[PDB]
Design a protein around this ligand. Structure first.
Ligand SMILES: O=C1NCc2c(-c3cc(F)cc4[nH]ncc34)c[nH]c21
Length: 259
């Protein structure tokens, strides 16, 4: 109720598409809070986060009752994967570790709230005008945009990002903060390669036996040795043996501080 935005306080620029998802489009929007704000509007045309508040977590501006609409802050620099892949951008190894640290802090907050993300990947993190990373694609903002990285379970209907998933998640379809810890390691490997696709020579069926063989993503050329050790710990076959997000924040901030 205290999340509701009056239709007169919002303009959805339906001709200005930010992105096309499975459950609906994200459009540019104008919102009157009495300041006029540029925002992003998620339509749920096919078919809790209000209490979440952390600088590295995507916040909910509100919902427009009126097709239901989800009003979110606007992210000037879009998703993290396309930002780092853009050949005209010049991030340094420090900028990239800085991004990883920011994601670890947002995930540390979410894990404390006992919230399991289930789809942590560089494509699911956003960058605002201050280059503040916001973990996104969760709660009311959850959706599938890049369908080539997902298998839809023919029984549950669950979207499964096979190449970001923990070995136990691939075997059971069960997701925990520790399987989110595994995806964080793949996300750090995405940062260090500037958005290369993970396991390009391994097809989605051969991935389980690949991981069972103790095989893992290889060290990217400009990845510092301690940061690769941090990735390797995220990918231990035993969920309990993996670091917590609190331990990842401490380890990564110490690596970031050596620069
Ligand atoms: O291709 C894309 N699909 C969705 C999307 C977003 C996005 C999602 C979101 F939940 C909030 C947002 N605020 N500003 C942008 C934005 C940016 N780019 C793309």
């Amino acid at each position: 109720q205290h999340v509701v935005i009056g239709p007169s306080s919002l303009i959805v620029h339906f001709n200005e598409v930010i992105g096309r998802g499975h459950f609906g489009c994200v459009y540019h929007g104008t919102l009157l809070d009495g300041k006029k704000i540029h925002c992003a509007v998620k339509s749920l045309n096919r078919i809790i986060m209000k209490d979440f508040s952390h600088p590295n977590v995507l916040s909910l501006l509100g919902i427009c009752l009126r097709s239901p609409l989800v009003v979110l802050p606007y992210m000037k620099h879009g998703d993290l994967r396309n930002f780092i892949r853009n050949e005209t951008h010049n991030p340094t190894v420090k900028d990239l570790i800085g991004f990883g640290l920011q994601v670890a802090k947002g995930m540390k907050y979410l894990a404390s709230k006992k919230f399991v993300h289930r789809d942590l990947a560089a494509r699911n993190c956003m960058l605002d005008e201050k280059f503040t990373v916001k973990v996104a694609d969760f709660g009311l903002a959850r959706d599938m945009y890049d369908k080539e990285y997902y298998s839809v379970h023919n029984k549950t209907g669950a979207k499964l990002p096979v190449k970001w998933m923990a070995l136990e998640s691939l075997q059971t379809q069960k997701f925990t903060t520790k399987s989110d810890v595994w995806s964080f390691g793949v996300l750090l490997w995405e940062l260090m390669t500037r958005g290369a696709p993970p396991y390009p020579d391994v097809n989605t069926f051969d991935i389980t036996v690949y991981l069972l063989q103790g095989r893992r993503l290889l060290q990217p050329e400009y990845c510092p040795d301690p940061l690769y050790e941090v990735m390797l710990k995220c990918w231990h076959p035993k969920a309990e043996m993996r670091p917590s997000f609190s331990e990842l924040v401490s380890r990564i901030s110490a690596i970031f501080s050596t620069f």
